[PDB]
């Protein structure tokens, strides 16, 4: 059934599963036309497909050419997402295919189900969690590869860097969700926290800075404060 607080540890068991987030697939800027009407201009997007146990991220870049001459783009975007997730599953060896795909938005359920009819044993699940994966485009290296793309492209990352050498998947996912929640709630402040100290660098092969265990505790506390703070500046508390 639906994935929620009560079954959260299931994410880190040994049954292969993927989250799919489609909130950055169809991205537009809204602008005025010379005649004073409103129009949109699409910009490159991406499907965010993540193994929460291993950190493996399959980042399918959606190039603006896929929308050319198409109608009802917000609806098409869900079906295009489902087509690409299905294609990814089919590309994986059988022993690497997921047993479950969890969609972050319920509107992806029917498109993904229909595209996965050939995989009756892969469960397609919604979630009650309000996960912050939209903020993925606030990770500088991910945003950069999406905007630079001149054609459809799949790029693989480990969204946990090397954290699993020192922490469990549960703790890694919790840190990821904290960082992304902070970037979503106040991107500028969150990025200030992560890069304030010029002596902590991001390795070429990593997405996040190379914090020590102690510095991660400090960082994580700072992100929590921000999320509470902003919750005051928003609710006046």
């Amino acid at each position: 059934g639906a994935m929620n607080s009560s079954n959260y540890a299931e994410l880190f068991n040994n049954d292969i599963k993927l989250f799919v987030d489609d909130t950055n697939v169809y991205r537009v800027t809204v602008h005025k036309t010379f005649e004073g009407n409103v129009a949109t201009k699409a910009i490159n997007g991406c499907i965010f497909t993540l193994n929460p146990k291993t950190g493996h991220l399959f980042l399918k870049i959606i190039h603006t050419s896929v929308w050319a001459g198409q109608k009802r783009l917000s609806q098409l975007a869900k079906w295009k997402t489902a087509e690409e997730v299905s294609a990814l599953v089919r590309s994986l060896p059988k022993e690497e295919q997921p047993k479950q795909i969890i969609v972050t938005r319920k509107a992806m359920l029917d498109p993904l189900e229909v595209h996965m009819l050939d995989f009756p044993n892969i469960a397609i699940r919604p979630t009650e969690l309000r996960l912050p994966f939209s903020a993925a485009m606030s990770i500088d290296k991910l945003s950069d590869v999406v905007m630079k793309a001149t054609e459809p492209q799949m790029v693989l990352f480990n969204i946990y860097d090397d954290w699993l050498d020192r922490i469990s998947s549960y703790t890694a996912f919790s840190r990821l969700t904290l960082l992304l929640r902070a970037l979503k709630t106040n991107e500028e402040s969150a990025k200030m926290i992560l890069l304030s100290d010029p002596t902590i660098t991001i390795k070429s092969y990593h997405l996040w800075p190379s914090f020590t265990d102690e510095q991660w505790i400090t960082i994580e506390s700072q992100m929590r404060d921000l999320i509470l703070t902003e919750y005051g500046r928003k609710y006046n508390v």
Partner: protein, 300 residues
């Protein structure tokens, strides 16, 4: 005009014949139903006074044999049977008619209701959905499940309606996933009409048969089938104009005949609102939309 005699009426029962019904008191001298119009299928149905549970009945066509009803005190129901001795039957009937112990099928001459509800229902096709080949008539009750219901448990006692499933490989061509899900014309016209049903006359008939079993027996799986067959048409952008015009007439008479106090359970809000207001055919069912709005505006 044909006749279905009864041996007797040993238990108190409400008897229906098509859209008509009457109550027969325990051991009341009652000997059957006469003046049944030739040319249509008919249904004779039963609800016992003591156990309103289990409505049950028999679909038949008097052109296919001489049928009568007899109560079985062991299995506890009124059973339809065929009398093969033509002269024995005619003599039984004529005697019961002379003694005026037969209700008269009470058809008004202006009234095309039964024709309009059964236009495409045949006894040969009903026998291909309700399988009991030794009999020329077909038993149906409130509890019988459909083949599709069983996929999700006694097969010989099932309604074999054509399984319709919008999220299935039968419904969705590889490579046309979005197209076929959002516009079911392929599935309606190629898979179902050209490939299974054989023509629209057979699609309309199973849709009519599904409705009548839902209404007369409260058969839940039949109601599911009726609504699925409506939804499959309304969700197709490409439907022959003659089918849409006929569907409007079909549904009009079904909605007109539905008992008002059963609408809550027999009508699926989602299907009807989708069909009348959101679907490709939202503007093609004028008669049905007008009767639905004047008779059941709450559902919408």
């Amino acid at each position: 005009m044909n006749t279905v005699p009864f041996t007797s009426a040993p238990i108190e029962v409400t008897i229906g014949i098509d859209q008509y019904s009457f109550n027969v008191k325990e051991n009341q001298p009652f000997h059957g139903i006469k003046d049944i119009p030739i040319g249509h299928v008919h249904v004779i149905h039963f609800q016992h006074a003591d156990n309103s549970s289990m409505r049950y009945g028999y679909w038949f066509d008097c052109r296919m044999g001489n049928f009568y009803i007899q109560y079985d005190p062991k299995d506890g129901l009124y059973k339809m049977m065929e009398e093969r001795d033509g002269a024995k039957f005619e003599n039984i009937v004529h005697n019961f008619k002379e003694r005026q112990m037969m209700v008269s099928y009470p058809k008004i001459d202006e009234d095309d209701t039964w024709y309009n509800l059964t236009e495409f229902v045949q006894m040969d096709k009903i026998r291909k959905i309700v399988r009991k080949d030794e009999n020329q008539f077909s038993y149906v009750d409130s509890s019988m499940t459909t083949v599709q219901e069983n996929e999700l448990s006694d097969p010989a006692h099932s309604l074999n309606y054509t399984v319709i499933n919008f999220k299935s490989r039968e419904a969705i061509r590889p490579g046309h996933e979005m197209e076929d899900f959002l516009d079911k014309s392929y599935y309606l016209n190629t898979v179902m009409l050209q490939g299974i049903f054989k023509n629209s006359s057979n699609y309309f008939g199973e849709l009519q048969f599904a409705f009548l079993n839902a209404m007369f027996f409260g058969n839940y799986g039949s109601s599911l089938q009726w609504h699925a067959m409506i939804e499959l048409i309304c969700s197709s952008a490409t439907v022959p104009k003659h089918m849409l015009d006929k569907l409007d007439e079909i549904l009009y008479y079904q909605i007109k005949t539905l008992p008002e106090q059963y609408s809550d359970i027999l009508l699926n809000e989602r299907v009807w609102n989708i069909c009348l207001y959101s679907s490709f055919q939202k503007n093609s069912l004028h008669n049905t939309e007008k009767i639905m709005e004047n008779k059941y505006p709450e559902l919408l």
